[model samples]
Target chain A: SAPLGPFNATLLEQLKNDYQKGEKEVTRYIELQEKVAEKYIKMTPLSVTAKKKLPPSKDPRDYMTLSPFWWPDSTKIDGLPYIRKDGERNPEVYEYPERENANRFGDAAYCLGVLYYITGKEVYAKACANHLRTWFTDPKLGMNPNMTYAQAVPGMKKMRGSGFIDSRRFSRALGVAKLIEGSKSWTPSDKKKLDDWATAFCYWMENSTQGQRESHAANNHGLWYEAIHLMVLAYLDRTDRIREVAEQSILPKMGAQIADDGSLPQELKRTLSLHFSTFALEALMEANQITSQIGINLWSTPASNGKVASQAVDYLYPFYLNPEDWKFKQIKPFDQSRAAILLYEAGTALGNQKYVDTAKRIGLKYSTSDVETIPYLVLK
Target chain B: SAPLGPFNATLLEQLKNDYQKGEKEVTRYIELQEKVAEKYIKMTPLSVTAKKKLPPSKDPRDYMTLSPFWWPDSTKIDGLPYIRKDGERNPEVYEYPERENANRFGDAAYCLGVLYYITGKEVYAKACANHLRTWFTDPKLGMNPNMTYAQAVPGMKKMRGSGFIDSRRFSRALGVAKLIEGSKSWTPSDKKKLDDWATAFCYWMENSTQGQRESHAANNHGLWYEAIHLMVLAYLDRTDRIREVAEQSILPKMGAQIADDGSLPQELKRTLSLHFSTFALEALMEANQITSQIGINLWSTPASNGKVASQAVDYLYPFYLNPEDWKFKQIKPFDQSRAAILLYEAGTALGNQKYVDTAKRIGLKYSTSDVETIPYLVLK
Candidate 1:
């Protein structure tokens, strides 16, 4: 009845109760609502068809984006094939509407869905429903159930497996459907249609060559792949394959990905070492949380190497004490907010109160930084 | 090691031997090679990406085309939605590259593959291999597997199930892989790659909404759907599901499709009654041929009403003697050539001599109609 993973239902229920009583009003909710109010006026129905620059396939429905880390190779005449500078996201990637709009659409769904639940606002639910319908069910507006052209490189495979990474946030937007499940604005029929789209999408993930490439990926991409796959399947209410995913995919891949020292050896090599390490763990927690719903305790689940997910969380937690003491090559200022609620969620999941306390202290620093920026709706 | 059903290996071997000795010299083979030589000069490679006019999704990789019998409704202010006119094909469908080029691509593959067998010319096999590679394997050029935007009407669902019918020829293009099997030009790796493409394509056929809609279609479309599905699985060498198609699909559906008198009640309703009737029977024969390879023996498989596929063939064969007595509406001149090779193939399969004799007499009229026109490459 509630969202399957990442967000806790019991905590959300308590937050809803608290908000109704006007007792200890969560500032993050207030910030998110204000932003939603502004967005509601400007936001129209979401659709992948609105992307103006069609992909190399010339299909607008294909979710297409340029490589975030790849920029024009200045050494070449035409810069036909972009070269990669690890961890540096090319600003030009934002110019592509598919990923950009997909995120903005996701941003609305997640916030509005949560807001609808916390505030009991029909308007918010209606808006979220419109976005879901246009993006998932409308034939002319919905994206084709494939990422054949996502994160395309200039002189590479026209579409690549890495493209699925850009849409992880977009996939998370689907989780919000559980929040507004019985709302008049988003009916049972609406939810079924969205589920059908997820069915087609899941087929693509397990079958497409691009998708298989991402499935077998070793770093954050692979973990996020599992997270998205698990989350979508959770929403689909089709859990037959989740155990296979746990035993065959997540367990084996997790062992190979994480080192005995609780570090992700592959992710640690990245320029944004901490960012990717945290991102990978966050994806693990997502799968962990969803697996919990089905009585498959992934937290108790161990890799072939005697390492658990909590160890990775433990190894990275020390860096929060002093990121400057971190031995990884983090070129850009680490956005602490990226891993803020992640710690809170993981701390509670592992029954570690200290990590939860640390999460509040760290997240509060940037929680109300500005309304113009995206709000992190952490539970008070 | 030999090619699968529909094309008989023993007969093909005899044709090959006759050609090498410069005896028998099947004129249809001679006519076909001349057409292929001309087509070789004009044909470059096949791809769905070459369409100048994009579909509603605007993805060139998505196979898109107008409904063949649908015309812009002149009754409306701007012809917002097209209207269906049975049997009379709108010339406008050719404006889209997906279907037209797909047919031409199939034409070249079938002719060149057989010619490669008859002539033992590496050039013919190489040209055929190039078409297969560019159309099926090339990322920049290959069409997306799903037909989500195919056969779109102006004001209805952007894509419809009827769209799969246009690509029936394209699916047949895959059969040539077996004809030119082990050619140096198209290696085993190339065969594996094409099989992978078929695997993806087959997934789309079974899963997508458009595919499901067509799968349940009750006309020639339904039979063609089975044909394409079985043909693809036969080539994929994954026949686990073909039996389900036989028992679950081919059996029950075949009962409702044909009458006790052997006439296809559904196809007869169309203005192109004779044409669609023949077309439906051909598709049935294709499925029948493939099913035989797997020891399923679909020819003997009867419908619940005791209506076997042979009845439909029996019902239609007499019309060849005098199409004026077809007893159904048809605007265009009846093209006996459409049913020419079909009757011979069906005749050989069903152990009927008259059909085989009638096929040669009828087909020879148009077999060498013109070298510039498409050749009907038949056995001597």
Candidate 2:
């Protein structure tokens, strides 16, 4: 059977055979994998252990980072109590360790695990295991399973509810973990520790004040919260909570946030309207993928107001096809190519040929390896 | 007078006419300039005001940044006294504002000023002036003249002498300042303020212990120190010190740093040996240009053991011609093309046709606009 998310065991077996037989389609992804693998070969595991100082947390092992959009007040003598500048990223957040480390771990794990599954390369799996152990299980170096000080604004809040968004990349990384589950490089003990860490993290997200506040967000934030919760619960074998959240939180938010016109109204109101709209739609698609595994079809579900996820994709389709048609505040020109992978997934799920055609056009326009992942997920 | 640098007023006049007449070589540079201009259209002036927090400094205006090569020890509880990881960059350096701001300022200024000279377009000059004012003259937004806290390590030293290298991009920016000296967009008052800022910065670099320490560096640091000081001194019209530094400090260092075999021993010791050797030689070329303005030719001047700048170029000529000849600790393959512009200047200055021929050969091997600067400098 296929896993709860993309890249199932059967798909892996077929990909491996085709890859070894030197089929161009499979070989192209292998080329991308080699490029990705080269990047991680010299990358040291960037863990929370690299921060020279820590914010106010129960343990120094807890992940901590500064808010990205806040800056020091110019008029203030000492420039304390940073102020907000929406849509402008303040570089200070990167000075701390957690955010950069978490991002590197997620990106490295996904690439290494994907390569390992494709080639059955023990070295790739061992490298992925090393990264996982350093970030999840190594007592001396592992990050604590909490975000008590994550996204803290100096002189303002200790940690904002928005900080939860920082960990959303883990959704893909967790998928990689499942892919490498029984590989010889990942021992039984390592699996147990990783499982324990995921459980603790999920518990915190459910019970913590910040996480609870984030759950009520009406935009991409809410969608990501559901996506992450579903992935973690699926990993922990908590089917009941996963189903409950899908029915109660995920379905309602998708219906409300995506308007009857098929536009993400909450996202369209952002400074980077097109970018946010695309981001929200991608999250919704991921939610649909997760819920579909548990016998729920979120892609076709309609709200009381009669809005469906397919309509959101439809509304954005024309603009994604021609960015000049976008009539909203976009600080940077939209890279139409970004919509290719999302459209490909949505098209296959909804049985819509227009979305697939547009995806193919954008794929040709952009020259990206992302379109390669689509055939495996959609065809078989 | 060409302002003792690569660009000269006579060359600018000729290029401007050719550009207006639609000559392909001149027009090609305009294409490069337009591409560069598009990048800065939306880039807000990244300033010290953006940091949420700062390190220890006497004034908030003092440029402060974290070192790029230090990481916290994994075994430590608080990860204090970050340890060194040579050849690996800590992305945290960019979290602060100086490095990014300085680089953008340098790159944008050069490109914009060059375009203004080429097209006589007021918009380019205006944009260049805006950038200059925001970074150097605007009281509310400009950085302080001193780098008292530049390149500070979180757990170790507050600042290091090596931090001066971060401002090395200023060498090109000062040339831009000269390029726009008499432009209508740059007011007399604006020039005065910019000049005052440069003067104060040069003073700090000369008087500070950190600055003095870096001056004695046997490799690229010492080379950059001379390059920056020469550019700033030329702007200030301090010809006597420029000549003194060139003869007393710059000349002897070239002899001591570059062995009789023409290899930069200090730079060759680095992981990126070829790259550093090329970088050191470029600085040597720029230094040669400065002294040549006063009728002193550092390129042909030999050390006691008889190694000249021409010999240095000859020694590395084989490696630049063929990367397979490099038997050093290079983590990445050397781009043989990076040496093209430097060799073009060296060939013209030393009257060595072999150097010019090799430069043209390498130029074809690599696609770059850097060779475009040669025709204006050499042909005239």
Candidate 3:
């Protein structure tokens, strides 16, 4: 196993040059710009792009919200697109009340924010701001509170926190925060309003009954909430809250959700096991990054001093080069190959040789992100 | 175990109406249109619509051909995408031979042809024609001969015929034949030339080493080839030859491919097992239609007088509904719910109560063509 010597060498050279350029200028402003760029590049490693372009619904009004599993059609109710408990096909009886957890509008705004951030253009930023305001600020257009009662179908009481989906929207708030970071064009009033909204949402996430249940899931959903919480808190500059939340919410859940074999118990419910496993690994890698930056050591395994983060990298690499290896063997529910990219980045950051070897072996066949907006993270 | 009486009655009524419609003018043409429609529908139950509404491919080339497994990023590879093997990334590494098999262009053409016939629309007809000319007739744009030598990699010495993805085009060709059945637009010269090309293709299918290898696949691939043969023969009006192909090629292969419990072996290889199983079944159903029209009994059991086709219908119906009843107890590969619509149709058409019962148990969660088409086929 070898470190990302060449890649790091190139990066170091670039960093040195930028530092020298800043040093040559006596002004503090030049030094600040170079420092900001350096941190931004290090923290952000990948950007995803949408692979599938969806046509707008024939009529937006025609679309009624449903549970995570429900697939809508005109004139008739079809069974939900997802599975149900007791494992029978959950028939299309009614739209589950749990449909409102995440804000679709927020997701759209976040995507626009990222698009604008990467292009360095104001058109995308303006569009993103408009979308955010329409959803969060505009009285007529905004959604009610948070996804408190979202995804709740009658008869199926909140078996677990159905609000996990709504928790996904928190990412958008973080995106907006990142977009406005150190920006002159972002008005103070707008920034404060956005910050207030995020703070309130975070309060709801930690205090609400549904939110607590989701935070305690010890599954991928739980990990997502934790990740979103950390990122959001970091964005809000809630340093003390970030540390407390990380210890209380993130670490214990990781121990419970991930098996010794590095598999997630939650994702096994889905049919595409390989793809789901990859998704879980990605979230874990994000957790590792947050923990590492904050001086937390969540990556340590129980057995030896060897890092379990390295195992995450090792587990995914071979599957890319040889899908048959895993195909021939019995894999748990959440096994996949898409984690190679994350493993590649994480390995580079940690100076883990095993991670790099696995990444090289897997190559890039499974590199295509299931979620769009994955590519932007990789570009310089 | 029991069937739905109402569904059976409805299907019977529709069958009677179709029969009457066929015989209103003449006696010989009675089942011809209905038979053609049924086969045409099965051949192309789904279509992949590109969401990109921009201009078509710049090179008039099939993007799927470049890399059937992964998408080509126009921003990258000279605006031309290439095939990704089991492991490689980078679309620039064009695997030309494998690329041809990866895209189901011919299959798409076939589906469009059916739509044109059913809707009596020029849009579908013209699209079908354009795609056909692009692949077979137009020298610069069209593909050369069979797809046998198509998946050639730059470094590879020779291309292998194991790349049987090209067979997807068979359905599209069948669609063309059905559309031209009694059309004035299809002049005798047009019909003869098309038939000559089809017949030549059929010859290549049987004589070419690649075609024979694929036919002996003893899986869905074998059935697809059989279905293609039956469809091509239908257009050419070579009834005697069709019968020979059905008995020798189709029937024997089904005997080898099917298990005592009615599980499909080929589909087990996919990440979405149930989805692939239904797909294979669709192909088999098409084969059954061709055999039934020619007055050949493919439904009879190998040992008992009971219909083997009926037995397969019974075995799969339960799995569609209470998949727990089957020995396999996990949802992997494809979602189990996808089979509901097709199972419903199979029940109604066979006049078996078990299938309808199974469909009801599976519940009403049909999405896309799978569920919607069932109502049209059964209720109508």
Candidate 4:
């Protein structure tokens, strides 16, 4: 594999510009890593001494934290509301508290992994390993193999398969997972377990009663979960199944969920419609990223689903570039567009100048403080 | 009453122009409302009849349905979120759930009152009274006095004062309450009950332990609750106590919680800092609004405790109109201006045009959706 030296140089320059222009802390951190990468470009063997620690639980199930579904009910659950899943542990499924943690944990792992891969540090790698082990590998304690009860609401006895909001946590985790491509520490056994877990998770997710119900949801959460599940599955070498799911679920759903003009019906109900729409698009872009990696053709059209991406872009772009175009409403305070980073990524992957240009327009309008979670991408 | 027909005619024309000019839906709503207010002027009814329908007990809270707080465990204890003070039901200690209904009912009454006042329509007045009876006056089902547990957390035995997030429902509700100033149909008993309830709620909210805990919160919930409690107190002739709290509690807490440069500590920890900050500011503005209404001069300078409103405003203002000044390391996706609206409102009330002008700058920069809650103000 090529050293990240050349990319590091360019990244460093951009970071400096952003910092000088008053970029956010996340940007500065990314820049710091890039700078470190620059200095170490000529060196090999970036491992650091691992600070080994005691395992999380005496019971193997303690490792379930890695599964992204395990969280203590800080607000106790006795006599509390429960969604009656047919056979789930708790009847109140939507009351689950771990979704936010899952998303945050996933992001930390993904981002820190990228830093580790570029720097080759065991500290970073171990952190990644620990997270995975706790979430996926620990036998005694780990999240259950399925997210069927991920977002079940109370009193409804049945979980609203539309409870797909929990899937947002995986957005950045996928990116982190990608950077782990040829690590010596990623043993074949580790790889197999992780892959099998994800594969089984996907199959159960798509075929289970809850999974099938969620699969047809014409909403942002549905699209996001479907896309994430498919992307991870594809990357893990479950190509046929992933492709089949994408064609059968993702494409059709995207068309139906996204209105003719590009507004997502489900997201529109949110207080922050503009921000929610951007979030939805960002998730789509993630799916698009995965598809590109696997050599699939996904295009936005001028009619129906074809225009979804462009319509959102058009709706959002003008406001992003010029605040003069912003009109206030009751739902949310403003449109948050960190997804421009994803757009930039998609543009780079597809060699599409439109995406890049649009991203730059949106990004430039953002203050350093406003660019949360979006990665910096530059057009060469 | 002077006819606002001519102003409405002109304002309506401008509203159409704004929509045609490609303003987003949120923005359009603001501009349109501005036009309606300008044309209809004081005669414009408060309630609009849209918020009053009782959608069945099983329907759940639909207005804030999308919010994560609406859960099965979130019980309607004590007609709100609070349990009884003794082991028995402390009906006087109003809970958050009751506050929700109170706000909605108050808003409905106030708005309908405005319509009746303007058009002399008994139906509007009758509708308002009927709705109020359903929640407050009816002996079998009326809400109890006080809000001791107004912001209870579901599944938790005791309510945290921080559950103040529930108070925002009052902002508009108070506006509705203002509309019902004088009506023969409004019985003295009803008025006395409302006054007593408001006073009791305010007393506990301001003097109770939980209330003090929340009052000290640096987040928007704390600030908004302070403002709401004050606003209702002012209406109930408890201006002196409310003003005292504003001076002693609200202003000082705002200083402590707000960063030296105006960043809110609570919001910075979340994934959406910009949105959270905006939410906080909305509450601050409410506090400011109440203070301004009762001739309690805040914001000029701190004569005691070395606190001043200008400091908070200064810290926050730049982020509102020019968010680029913010140095927090998080990703910001939306424009920060929840406080700016308050600045404008307070400025309008205090005869300070600068506040209004500053608000416009922030308003213009806000995302189209953020402005929906107070669209007409932007137009003004």
Candidate 4 error regions (>4 Å): A1-31, A34-97, A171-175, A299-308, A322-330, A342-355, A361-380, B1-380
The deviation in Å at residue B260 for candidate 4 is: 31
Docking model 4 quality class: incorrect
Error of 4 at A207 (Å): 1.5
lDDT (tens digit, per residue) of candidate 3 on B278-375: 67777666665555556664555342332255555555665665554555423332356556556665664567676666666656432233312332
Q: Fraction of true contacts kept, per model?
A: 0.00, 0.05, 0.00, 0.00
Report the Cα lDDT for candidate 4. Answer: 0.50
**Cand. 3 Cα-lDDT:** 0.49
DockQ agreement of candidate 1 with the native complex? 0.01
Cα-based lDDT at residue A233, candidate 4: 71
Q: Which portions of model 2 show Cα errors greater than 4 Å?
A: A6-17, A20-24, A364-380, B1-380
State the weakest 10-residue window (summed lDDT) of model 1 chain A.
A366-375
Better of 1 and 2 by TM-score: 2
Which candidate, 2 or 4, would have the higher lDDT against the true structure?
Answer: 2
Score residue B41 of candidate 1 by CA lDDT. Answer: 36
TM-scores vs. true structure, each candidate: 0.48, 0.54, 0.49, 0.43
The CA lDDT of each predicted structure is 0.73, 0.72, 0.49, 0.50
Best by lDDT: 1
Q: Compared with the true structure, what per-residue lDDT tens digits does model 1 show for residues A201-317?
A: 999999999889899998889888988898778777777788778888898888887787888899889888888888888788778767877777565578777767777888889
Superposition error at B93 for model 2 (Å): 8.0
lDDT of 3 by residue, A1-380 (tens): 11111112233334334444564422232233223222222221111111122112322111123344433332222222344432222333221221222343444455445434433456545555655554554444443344454454433434446445454453544545456343444667767777776777778777888778887775567777777676667657666776786666666665565556755546555554456556666665555545555555455532232325445445646665555455422322433334455656566666777766665555543223222222212221
Cα lDDT for residue A342, model 1?
74
